[PDB]
Amino acid sequence: SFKYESAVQYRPAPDSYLNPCPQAGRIVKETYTGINGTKSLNVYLPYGYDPNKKYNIFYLMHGGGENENTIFSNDVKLQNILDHAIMNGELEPLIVVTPTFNGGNCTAQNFYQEFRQNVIPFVESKYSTYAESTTPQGIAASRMHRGFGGFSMGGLTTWYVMVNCLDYVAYFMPLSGDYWYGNSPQDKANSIAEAINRSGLSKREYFVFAATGSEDIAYANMNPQIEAMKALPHFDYTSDFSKGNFYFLVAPGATHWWGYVRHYIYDALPYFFHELEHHHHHH
Numbered sequence: 242s243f244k245y246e247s248a249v250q251y252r253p254a255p256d257s258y259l260n261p262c263p264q265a266g267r268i269v270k271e272t273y274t275g276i277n278g279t280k281s282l283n284v285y286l287p288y289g290y291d292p293n294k295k296y297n298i299f300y301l302m303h304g305g306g307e308n309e310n311t312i313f314s315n316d317v318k319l320q321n322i323l324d325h326a327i328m329n330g331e332l333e334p335l336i337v338v339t340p341t342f343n344g345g346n347c348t349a350q351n352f353y354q355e356f357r358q359n360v361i362p363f364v365e366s367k368y369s370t371y372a373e374s375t376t377p378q379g380i381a382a383s384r385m386h387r388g389f390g391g392f393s394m395g396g397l398t399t400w401y402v403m404v405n406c407l408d409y410v411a412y413f414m415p416l417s418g419d420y421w422y423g424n425s426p427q428d429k430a431n432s433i434a435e436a437i438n439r440s441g442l443s444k445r446e447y448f449v450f451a452a453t454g455s456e457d458i459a460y461a462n463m464n465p466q467i468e469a470m471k472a473l474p475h476f477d478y479t480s481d482f483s484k485g486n487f488y489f490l491v492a493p494g495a496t497h498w499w500g501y502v503r504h505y506i507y508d509a510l511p512y513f514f515h516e517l518e519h520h521h522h523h524h
Contacts, residue, residue: 243331243333243515244524245481245515246480248479249490249512251490251493251508253501253504254503258321258322260321261321264327266287266290266323267285267290269283269284269286273360273363275355275358275359276346276355277344278344279344280340280343280344281309282309282340283309283338284336285323285336286368288324288334289334292368295371296334296335296336297335297370297388298365298371299336299337299338299513300337300388301337301389301414302340302398303342308341309339317499319337322503326507335514336364336370342398349401350397356389356406357409370383371386371387380409384409385411385446386411386514387410388412388514389413390506391418392499392502393497395416396417396419399413399416400418400419400420400422403449404432407442408440411446412448412513412514413447414451414506416451416452416506417460417497418459418463419459420432420466426468429466430466433473434473444475444476447486448487449476450512451467451490454494454496454497455491456496456497457497457501490508492504492505
């Protein structure tokens with residue numbers, strides 16, 4: 242049963258978590274048409290998915306050179322970790338979506354546009370999230386139960402959906418990717434602060450759990466950005482999201498590889514979606 246820690250440490254999922262779990266969530270390959278043409282994504286539904294219940298939803302972006310199938314492929318096997326963690330009660334059941342920034346005019350930088358207009362309404366009109374409808378209003382009203390994250394170029398994607406979709410998304414998990422908007426870490430932090438100001442949101446209404454490896458080249462640009470963000474009044478640094486809203490997990494020895502990054506998700510995802518949640522839980 243999950244309890245917040247104030248400075249959670251890196252810990253890989255046990256080796257057994259990388260093998261198939263008997264209580265396997267169903268993975269559905271979807272195809273949809275949006276502002277970047279016809280594209281696909283995968284939807285992980287938790288074991289025992291019941292469409293007359295409401296589930297948190299976490300959108301997760303691949304890295305450069307990858308696609309919408311990568312994260313659930315033999316090269317990553319994230320679904321096995323998800324399955325084991327949900328079965329063991331470490332992670333509350335949720336829907337995980339793996340889209341792609343490939344195709345048409347789409348890029349890692351501009352993906353948030355298609356995310357808002359096409360991806361959310363397509364996925365969340367078919368599956369049971371906290372969105373009662375998929376109008377802009379219905380999506381905004383369910384933002385506390387929606388998360389976005391991604392690795393490398395997908396980490397960059399994450400920062401851009403953050404600055405552009407605070408109205409729709411409350412939880413962010415940028416993994417090994419920095420925000421490429423500014424000529425200094427202060428410019429970066431200030432852009433995020435301005436986005437938060439514009440949104441009108443309180444510090445209890447958005448959460449960032451960033452992560453990388455101590456030997457991942459992304460650290461070089463992430464770390465200065467994180468330090469600059471720490472100095473903003475908009476962020477209270479701690480992994481205990483009952484108290485604050487910002488943390489940066491750095492895994493000792495880990496390099497730029499999904500073999501490690503999948504474990505950051507195992508560590509970080511259980512921290513999401515408890516603030517203003519609809520269940521009666523003690524964390």
